[PDB]
Symmetry: D2
Subunit: 500 residues, 4 copies
């Protein structure tokens, strides 16, 4: 079993994954300065469970063990809320994407979905999945959730693409398992993971049956190639000096995972051709994940903190407009938080026994996350001033000629250390333009689906026929009232009482 | 005991309150067409408790009775959440302000505050207050919450006003009780209430001791005058015909309550000179009330439904831009709901036993409420079209010459009854410009305090120093870290891992 | 000739238009308290021309006379700008819709359109139109612009409606002229006008030929019935007392115009069957009218003033948040102003000699008008406080017992007259919820087309192919560059120089 | 005389400016890959003037020469509008900050300000300034506008700082000129300029008289040290390969200018102790420069085009939500343009003869600029998809094994070259997170002052008392009407009926 962050880091050494970064094979990711910040972030998920056991670990009814909360199958609405509390804490502690939420949300969504496949088909995907959960809980591993394919022409489904590999598919089968080819793009923390769960990314039709595959692969499976994603300001991490990085210790990681006839044994296959359940899996995965964006409220707390610090250093902490902007940042940030925890608080039990958060409220959390981080970032930049983008390099600050000039001229209020003022400005740059903006801004935009995806799911659940009848009642319209034909689950949850 | 909405309406008859409306004494408010819709709204709070007992009634540990949820002192976070579920449901059912939330929030806030006054002062305000709760629970009454005074010069406190009566104060005392003078403005449902609880509206200093008065008065108390507030489109109610009203059955009510040496016996006095607790009472009342604005999400549901209906009648229900606007309305509306129910879900036990919702999240609920109704209304008007403001009167629709012309020319898609298209347009007008916009828009703006009041309360709780230290840690700043000196309660609630006393 | 406002009001007396309001024919609109505010607003357009001749009157090349600017066919970009300056002034002076812009914009758009019909068809519409212009310039009359039909099913065109009358059409022809039936809805100031110009409201196909009719009718034409539109708080005008009206002197007017076989002689027909020019007329009318919404910036000025006045009366004029809100109101209001005048400044000469403002910039003006008045309103309500909607009636203020109580208890800061505080609150109510909100809010929303209409026009002129090529150039993309196939007029205006 | 952009590039060679970048003196900025894109942007200001003479060149009444429009003292409202037309075109052509506007706005503002100093004090700053304009017009030079000092404690003015050098000041004088010390921060294109005009940045009181200094210095003046500013993704320029840069040919430049006893001869001094005119100079400089932000609408045009291109490549160009977002971007961008050109169109003649644009409308232009680029960028990222931030490097694309995998898997619709999809994504990254976002976003925010600065200037001109009286009139309030005590100039311009007097 992995126990500490240090144990986790050790577990990543000597694995010989095939990883391309800047046209070179990376022999040891743990030692690569661009990659190590992402690993440190994951390590903190282990360290928090040691320092704050009630927050970051759970009693598993599946294994009868205390497990890391990222590997816990939620047994109550309270367990869902605890995920959110842990996520905000980790965002405060790291200021970045700590990567492990995807696999948590994947596992929780698989628990219920596998149960339902088996109920219809008489298969044993749920039994297979539970044995997997027991293993990863006992060993305390990091699990990637690999849903999003490259997708090719966005207007066409899998079976209509010119190249069938643009969504991940079964290419062959034998007595011992399946072989899959394809790719998964934008994969958070995959190189830092022990196992990756491949999942379909779209509703599938009967024509798309070969793409109805879910399966768990070890990170070091044969036939996998990882091609690392660049980030804004990525190579600052490779430069000597830590100031210009802004957040030197922590960062995120994305890569493209290429699959060439990768083998998955039957015991790790959780869906095989049951195309009509792809949409259920995507729906439930995105239901959880869309309110895991509570994590971004911890980032928000850090960015607010940074804005308040630079205002202090600049000698204008208590001016009205700055105080007002800091309030606005806080308000926006808490609006996201409220939506996410409301979703979790409103969760309900699924047939398999796992709790699922409220889907509608999850869409609201995520939809606001697509908007507000951009505004929080803009207001931070206002408060910081122009030096947030014109500051000289640390190499210049350390220079014998340029350095004293910078120490003199980049003074803020008397008594503030210029190096501290530099460091806080670089943190702001990092979160609004640089490496951690990838997560704070663009992942807020696209993670668990682009804005339009949330709108379509709100549309599905927003009970417009029910609402029409409310309005007709009040307007005294009686003669054209129609029975709603729509999903009616949301108001059943909103108005749930002990009498149903 | 009042059981039904009909019983409630009968309890309002024959009371001879002194009520001025349009320069006339109103002899029987129940029979006045401008007032009756607000009565109907309150009656629905009784009817809902009969139809949906688990939603709208509660088991009181105070009395051991099943009580209307508006009279219940919340015993759990679940109880707070149920207040919100009830609120949204009543909003859906009435499309208006149903008035009784203010008294519920007042009672909940007084339960904890009176306990704490007594703890310090050795008084028996809490005992008095519980006897009051028992009475109103047994009798199933409507309670007004009368906090906001007229206030005069906004830049000055009570003792600095030119006229001391511009905030409500004690003017005399005797062996049996106190006598108060002043006024309470903007008072929701006061004429429709059985009792009204007077409460200070602002932090009080020692110089403001005379204004540190909380007391319950019967609505028919001697020395009270009510001066009714106008509303946008108020007088449509008094015209024959119901179409132009939009929502003819339900509305809200506000009045100015004047107090001239009104007597309050000791048993109904819940604060008497302990000025240092005024800020506690206001804080806690506003904490509850700022997330009672979940009620406005039920009104949002109605408005969304009206916009979808007119789109249907117009022949364009499925056009992209309209669908996208209805999604937006829904998203903004649910954002408010989420904030309010999160506040309630995150509630904590007070010393007296009552649960208080999360103050920070209440601020967020209300602050959003100050913004989003205005946008939902704008979008509704876009979807409706120009006829929302140019539609001819019902008297023209019923006219032998004009009426057939309107039935011909105001057609929507084939098969839609023109009267139904007119009715839905009037509903939209009513909620965005007319009588129900008073509540949906302007009370969203000012109820439980104007926007700036929320911003100041967010500021008080937003833990800037804590957050500065988070940022310093990540930036590698170590040599100027300061211990925060600020309220730290919010993050204690946010990161609370279990429900414990130790 | 009409010269003064008083002359204009006299011109309206004794006409016996058939006007239904509240199920009764109105005997004398000039004396009806609900109608007279709208008449007063139009009278101000005459009085302004006497007080401020350079602003509100123009030298007409067509008649060789000084004419009211509302009747002037623009001869330069300066003439378009002067329209806007006059509009804002009139908004400041009346705080309402003063009605006469529609006819101005109709006439300017007909001047160019008629010329183009004739260029193609060899007809005499432009010559007819110019004789009409000469007459109304000499007589100094008020002209309604009656474009918008009731429209029936919004998803169907004229020839597809279940009732052909739902758009206005020719129903018969004589040796002397045409006969039209139909209706025009939401008609600004029509009962207050001398002449009304009927115009088609949509693109017409060949099947819609019967609906290709433009003609001028006198307001007292046989076969016309007017049905007056309600407004929020309309009947306050009919109550004794002026306080509760907010703006007692001025207001707007809409009515539904019903046409039953109304005769139009040939000399007043400016389009007869040339369906392919309907789109041109609608485009050019809306081009002008979309930036006539500068008028709403004068209303904004009044509402800002009212907000600042109530802050003063409340004793908090200089508090930071109120100052900031006032600034925001000002910024939004000026953004609308700027878009309007930029459109006008960028105008270009048409074949007929009239100048047309920049259509793209007009769209931007209007689109911002659909948004910002709602925000300005919201902020005014914030500043005013709750009394803006809970204030007792004037009848209570004048009562011998209730009145003294109101004088005492509705005090603001010392020295402020309570009646003045009541008055300013009622003005705010009037402009944000009551009669003048119809114009300020809902007419901002729908006048010259609902928001979507402006979006479609921006789309038509936004030169996406040109922009794609800009980006491809800078990205170093060379091998898939396509020639744009789109209207290219906007950037020709943006970059216009003496060299073309 | 410099004619072409090539001539301009050659003029920059061999000057030996002291420039620190990454802890080294830069030997030849023209050949440094981080610096050359900024140079290329300035070169395009010369090339445009050759290609499009009427747009980018002007007939100067000062010299009687045809001059680059960046060196032209505006003689009409039309000349102000032409500045904005040129700005938007340059933004379209470069997608970056092309640097030369700041000098233009500085020179326009100094023209009127020097005249007024002399009118009061009997000095010859205006005559000196005109000789300077003649020189730079004849030689066709690039002029920096160096106003913003580092400023120290933002709550304190110059004479109150702990270190007097935190705002630039005169430290000595002699028979031939003044000597100045201090620094100027965030200086656009300064290393790419021939001359730099130093100007005070704040209202000055009598105690601040030593800081009341305006003067022109050659970029190669003795006692000057430049310290280059970093930019998001700066070092991509220094890597082999051009794809990951997004916009490889063009970028911006900002440096800290350190002044150590720099000599300015009298003929290049345009203010010397007349502290009461600092406010005037700042106001007028910011008046012009706040609507020079029309430049950002040309950048908006590029970003819109990039968003439309990626939608095409992805196979969803005509989906309603994407079309609607494109429309929104266009609307916000045009709103900025309209405010700027309205300001220009509404310009008025100053005492010296130069035209000044409408200050109120400039504030509105700039204030919208502080908001809308951020939304345009957000929408572009929505349309692009996740690859805008997860795309592998060009070195991976060119790798013999990884490259073919990327060519296969990063396909868009059939027929789209994957290299072109990569390139357009990098352009979007460059403009929203990388090197050109410095200008598009953060300079939109702070250039010519932070948002609060615009709010205070709107407040000064918004004629609240006048508006209160409008509302009083309509409400029927007659007995407490007060005469406004405020600047009344804006509505004088709004309601001006003719071009007179
Ligand atoms: S983006 Fe945030 S929610 Fe998603 S995996 Fe990263 S830390 Fe967790
Ligand atoms: S406004 Fe809403 S929350 Fe307030 S009392 Fe009325 S119904 Fe309840
Ligand atoms: S709404 Fe404005 S632009 Fe339209 S007619 Fe009325 S005053 Fe003129
Ligand atoms: S940021 Fe734009 S306006 Fe400013 S100098 Fe650069 S190109 Fe010109
Ligand atoms: Fe995510
Ligand atoms: Fe309220
Ligand atoms: Fe209009
Ligand atoms: Fe700038
Ligand atoms: Na490093
Ligand atoms: Na580094
Ligand atoms: Na009635
Ligand atoms: Na009625
Ligand atoms: Na009247
Ligand atoms: Na009246
Ligand atoms: Na390079
Ligand atoms: Na490069």
């Amino acid at each position: 079993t992995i126990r500490s962050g240090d144990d986790y880091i050790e577990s990543l050494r000597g694995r010989d994954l095939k990883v391309y970064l800047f046209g070179e094979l990376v022999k040891e990711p743990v030692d690569h300065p661009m990659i190590r910040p992402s690993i440190n972030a994951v390590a903190e998920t282990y360290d928090l469970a040691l320092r704050e056991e009630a927050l970051a670990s759970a009693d598993s009814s599946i294994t009868g063990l205390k497990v890391n909360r990222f590997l816990h199958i939620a047994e109550s609405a309270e367990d869902l809320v605890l995920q959110n509390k842990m996520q905000r804490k980790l965002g405060q502690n790291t200021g970045t994407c700590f990567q492990r939420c995807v696999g948590m949300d994947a596992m929780n969504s698989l628990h219920s979905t596998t149960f339902e496949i088996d109920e219809k088909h008489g298969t044993d995907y749920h039994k297979r999945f539970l044995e997997f959960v027991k293993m990863v809980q006992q060993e305390n591993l990091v699990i990637g959730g690999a849903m999003t394919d490259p997708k090719g022409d966005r207007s066409k489904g899998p079976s209509e693409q010119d190249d069938p590999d643009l969504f991940t598919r079964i290419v062959d089968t034998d007595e011992k398992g399946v072989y899959v080819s394809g790719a998964k793009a934008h994969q958070t923390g995959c190189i830092n993971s022990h196992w990756i769960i491949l999942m379909p990314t779209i509703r599938l039709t009967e024509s798309d049956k070969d793409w109805a595959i879910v399966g768990a692969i070890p990170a070091d499976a044969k036939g996998v190639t990882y091609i690392y994603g660049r980030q804004s300001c990525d190579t600052r991490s490779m430069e000597e000096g830590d100031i210009d990085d802004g957040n030197a210790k922590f960062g995120g990681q994305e890569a493209l995972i290429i699959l060439d006839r990768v083998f998955i044994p039957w015991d790790k296959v959780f869906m095989h051709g049951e195309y009509e359940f792809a949409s259920m899996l995507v729906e439930r995965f995105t239901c959880y994940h869309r309110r895991s964006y509570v994590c971004k409220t911890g980032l928000g707390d850090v960015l607010i903190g940074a804005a308040a610090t630079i205002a202090d250093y600049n000698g204008v902490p208590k001016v009205s407009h700055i105080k007002d902007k800091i309030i606005e940042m806080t308000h926006l940030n808490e609006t996201i938080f409220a939506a996410g925890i409301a979703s979790s608080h409103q969760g309900q039990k699924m047939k398999s026994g796992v709790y699922l958060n409220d889907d509608m409220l999850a869409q609201v959390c995520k939809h606001n996350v697509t908007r507000f981080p951009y505004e929080i970032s803009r207001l931070a930049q206002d408060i910081a001033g122009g030096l947030v983008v014109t500051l000289p390099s640390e190499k210049d600050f350390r220079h014998p000629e340029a350095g004293p000039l910078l120490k003199k001229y980049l003074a803020g209020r008397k008594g503030v250390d210029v190096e501290n003022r530099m460091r806080i400005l670089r943190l702001i740059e990092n979160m609004t333009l640089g490496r951690n903006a990838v997560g704070y801004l663009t992942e807020s935009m696209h993670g668990a689906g682009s804005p339009q995806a949330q709108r379509i799911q709100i549309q599905r659940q927003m009970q417009v026929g029910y609402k029409k009848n409310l309005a007709k009642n009040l307007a005294g319209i009686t003669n054209d009232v129609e029975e709603p034909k729509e999903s009616s689950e949301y108001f059943k949850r909103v108005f749930k009482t002990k009498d149903s």
